[PDB]
Symmetry: C3
Subunit: 450 residues, 3 copies
């Protein structure tokens, strides 16, 4: 049977105290609503109906590329009213799962189980057991099926001790949604049209409502403020870390590890404390990451060691390379196999060839460096004033003496040797030695002012 999703995301999120609407705040680097959209897609949803309202323009800009049907809800008259805005687009004989944009941790596995348990022409309701269920609607079962959701203020002493409560997440066919939504009223203290009332309406029609318990309480938790959001973040990171640990990644402390994207890994990977992995990251076999590193959108080959406090982005590092500590790889940094990048070195939009070393106090930008080069401490690639970031081309087996400035556009051919303290503006030929002639004044018997 086909499937489509409805995601409620119209909320202002007042207690976030933000200019953003509620569902755009991030978990693991990605909006809460994007998590739910992805999960909806994982389930094989044909359509995803996004009910939006507050911060409409921001929603549109932040989620511009998402494959969803944009359903504007001008007035927040209740969860049933929200879902009914998308109802005209429901296929009569597809299943519809209702999800909430502020509850990002809900898993595919739990939702697959919910959908499977849905009886024909009936409802599958996602429930959860709370140790303190105070305030939530209690699930009343009579011979396997949900006959009522009894609210806190209505429940008797016996019912108050029921720990199983309603989450509001549910599945039913499109025809049934269209039918029952038109029959939901707002005769209550809040004057709202509640999706909850579908359970009563289903029982009225002698249609079966089946309860399906969520395994994890936190999986169905929503975030109404940033304290709650921080709790979801930590639960999520702990779970990501646990999975990686069971896959054989050595994470020294999973409470001090953050993944904000996707990690692909080989075997015997070691990640020390306080590492942050962002975007799409790939690590080969036996990669070692030291404390305090940040990797965003990088590919790291086999047997690479990244030493502490290194920051890498949009970069590629070949096998057996050595990076850090205190190294900076900026976008377009491409390090070949067996290369070396050391402390207080910045590499931007440059390729560095096999075996080459750049180990101290150096800036290399917009450059091509060949194989087995020695880039001395203090070397800087620079431009003339008013230039448009021109390129420095360094061949193979070149020695560049310490504290030399390479002034682009310039080429240094294979086997060239450049002395310390040189200013290179003209191209250097193959096997050309360039050394600076210094003039110095020597004054003997100069007593220092001490």
């Amino acid at each position: 049977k086909a499937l489509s999703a409805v995601i409620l995301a119209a909320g202002k999120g007042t207690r976030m105290y933000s200019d953003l609407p509620k569902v755009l705040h991030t978990i693991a680097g990605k909006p809460m609503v994007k998590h739910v959209i992805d999960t909806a897609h994982q389930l094989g949803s044909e359509n995803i109906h996004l009910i939006y309202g507050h911060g409409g323009d921001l929603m549109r800009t932040h989620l511009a590329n998402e494959q969803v049907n944009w359903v504007l809800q001008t007035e927040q008259l209740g969860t049933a009213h929200a879902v009914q805005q998308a109802a005209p687009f429901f296929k009569d004989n597809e299943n519809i799962v209702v999800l909430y944009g502020d509850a990002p941790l809900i898993t595919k596995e739990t939702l697959e189980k919910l959908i499977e348990a849905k009886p024909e022409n009936g409802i599958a309701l996602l429930t959860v057991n709370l140790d303190n269920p105070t305030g939530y609607g209690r699930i009343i079962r009579e011979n396997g099926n949900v006959v009522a959701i009894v609210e806190q203020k209505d429940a008797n002493a016996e019912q108050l001790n029921i720990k199983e409560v309603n989450t509001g997440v549910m599945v039913s066919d499109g025809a049934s949604f269209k039918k029952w939504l038109a029959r939901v009223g707002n005769n209550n203290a809040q004057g709202e049209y509640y999706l909850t009332d579908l359970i009563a309406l289903a029982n009225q029609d002698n249609c079966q409502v089946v309860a399906v318990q969520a395994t994890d309480v936190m999986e169905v938790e929503g975030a109404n403020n940033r304290l709650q959001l921080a709790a979801l973040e930590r639960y999520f990171q702990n779970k990501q870390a646990s999975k990686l640990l069971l896959e054989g990644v050595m994470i020294y402390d999973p409470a001090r590890f953050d993944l904000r994207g996707t990690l692909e890994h080989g075997k015997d990977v070691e990640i020390d404390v306080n590492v942050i992995i962002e975007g799409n990251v790939k690590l080969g076999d036996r990669v070692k990451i030291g404390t305090g590193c940040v990797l965003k959108n990088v590919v790291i080959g086999n047997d690479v060691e990244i030493k502490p406090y290194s920051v890498l982005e949009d970069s590629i590092v070949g096998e057996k390379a050595a990076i850090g500590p205190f190294s900076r790889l900026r976008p377009g940094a491409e390090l070949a196999a067996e290369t070396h990048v050391g402390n207080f070195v910045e590499i931007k939009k440059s390729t560095v060839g096999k075996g080459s070393k750049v180990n101290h106090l150096t800036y290399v930008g917009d450059s091509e460096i060949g194989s087995n080069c020695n880039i001395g401490a203090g070397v800087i690639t620079c431009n003339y004033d008013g230039a448009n970031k021109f390129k420095t081309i360094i061949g193979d087996d070149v020695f560049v003496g310490s504290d030399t400035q390479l002034v682009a556009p310039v080429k240094v051919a294979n086997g060239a040797t450049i002395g310390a303290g040189t200013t290179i503006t003209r191209d250097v030929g193959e096997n050309e030695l360039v050394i600076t002639r210094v003039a110095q004044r020597h004054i003997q018997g100069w007593q220092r002012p001490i």
Copy 2:
């Protein structure tokens, strides 16, 4: 009714294994006793009587500016004896609250409630419920009021199961303190004069003793060693973080956030993991702080992003500025709006004008830099030998080529251009171009030793 405070702080703190006396060890960057003094001041205390003893000279130096009455207790003969040293200074018809210098987490709100509950000519006693009350004096209530504090060794089976215990924190009027303190004896296993005995003496005089429970167990906890102190630190930081989160500050992980002072914030502020905020810090709207940053006594304007592993102190940063990663702002660094400071850059006691950039491997000290300047990689401001840190003055729209040394005292006027590898000792005029004439030796066919 007026109020004054007495703070017991005479302890050696032997189990700290320190040359400091007990109450000078810090929580959130500030001595335990200073927390209590501040809380006493928040309550509107007219006088604060500080009972001190061990490490007297250190107490005097560390708390020199505190508005307290210094009451020296030469012998630690007990809590009642301690309080009686300050008693001659009690006003007969002011309230007196007794606090302990090693219990820094006690809140104003709890103490206001304690004072409010104090019956005329009676005592208000702060109590706390412990799940394991073993060792502590059990509170015995007979019709709403405290009739006895029964110690562990005296209590019967029934009383041993009482979970409410005595904290020793109490409020009574000055006249009553003077009266009852003179009647406290030391006939006990320890030979000490216990403040606890005031409850018995109050009941003797048919004066009412009212119990007031503390909401948080940790709020009344003292620290006798550094393990306990670390527990108070974490409880305190968690509470500070929680408050900020509910105020709308996005703290990615509140377990990896430290505030040691005061934070003023706008809306939509984002703070990544392992950030430390010290002294008085102010952040505008939409400030983003990356992982590993340290901010001490800084003002940060709207829309500033501070990238990872940046350390800033006694500095000001204008709106839309970009700092980091690996940036160092030392005291007196003043960055205007829309400025840029990059990796491995150190700025000390300098002003940098709007739009200017200092992006790599640079030291700027004792300088004024104007607007829209380009400070190249490797640039260093320096002095002659035996100088007294003289100033470098750089005007507006100046280009300083990479690896140039600026030798103070020197001025570079508006629109000047300085070539790479230059040593500037003489003033540079408006629209003056200064380039270094290099002499180089070129040797062709130099085969490298490889």
Copy 3:
């Protein structure tokens, strides 16, 4: 009575998903099996019989220097079979303690207590109380002694509620081991020879089996995968941190502190969050370590402050020195008393004399620097091409101007002064002033392209 140990370490550790065998994965920087070997040595074990199998060659290379008897178990036919491989080497009247290489947290104190409780010709069995004992063999006591270990599948309702279970850790004399091991069969669902069966065999011979409870559940926990290993790591670090805190080390957050080796400390030492201590580290009195530092094999004198994000290895720092932030000490760095090393400075295999300062953007390698020297920002020690890392010798009271290159081999004698931007290739004499003669072209009225 003499003592020897047997350590079971033959396991593949399949669920680690590693090329290493199970017991070589590290806790606190050291293989799990090495922890157990050290503990065995602490007890005064005469021989340590290491039962190994999978990853034999890796075990041999990683533990090459360990004083153990290498006992190869070609087939893992069970714990009794494992121990019997070492049995021929047991002395008849020495005690033998059996330990597991994947359970590294077992303490000397617990094992001393186990051995003490061993009755003559009997067995001492280490047991532990679990809240959920499901799956583990229940200890059956009849008048003080263990009469049976009843497995999950055999136990009756009453026995299932027994919380005390078997750990497999046990002590008995060598003669008794030889006797009973020969009588262990493999008639069970797994077809394995279980060491557990010694308890039945002991009771058969009317020999006493005494239960000794472990105080900490985690102390006897093994790690079968990296998630479990991470849990052992955190328990271990928490325990190390707690001990240091009770000894008087101020650890700001013990959940963000890692010791991977041994720490020797004085009084009033302060360690901020996210510090890693590796190898053998010694800190004097009043040492302050700022956030993010890494210290590996270092000696730090009294009153040293190490500021944030400093990385030190195989180095010595004299009293009252100031290091950091962003300082790098590489192996062989020897800093005298009252020295200063600042941000973006790298010191390798060099000695730096009393009072000298190296405060910015500098590399010093293979050098000797005397007392009260001023090493300016941007200074770099370097070599000629094809050199073998020659030495730079700087005397006392030398001023080296900013951005100067020192080209080894070279000597600069006492009291010399070197101007900024100099290239030093020739030796500098006592009280010699060396300044660079720059040639510059000045072009007036150069309008920048803006």
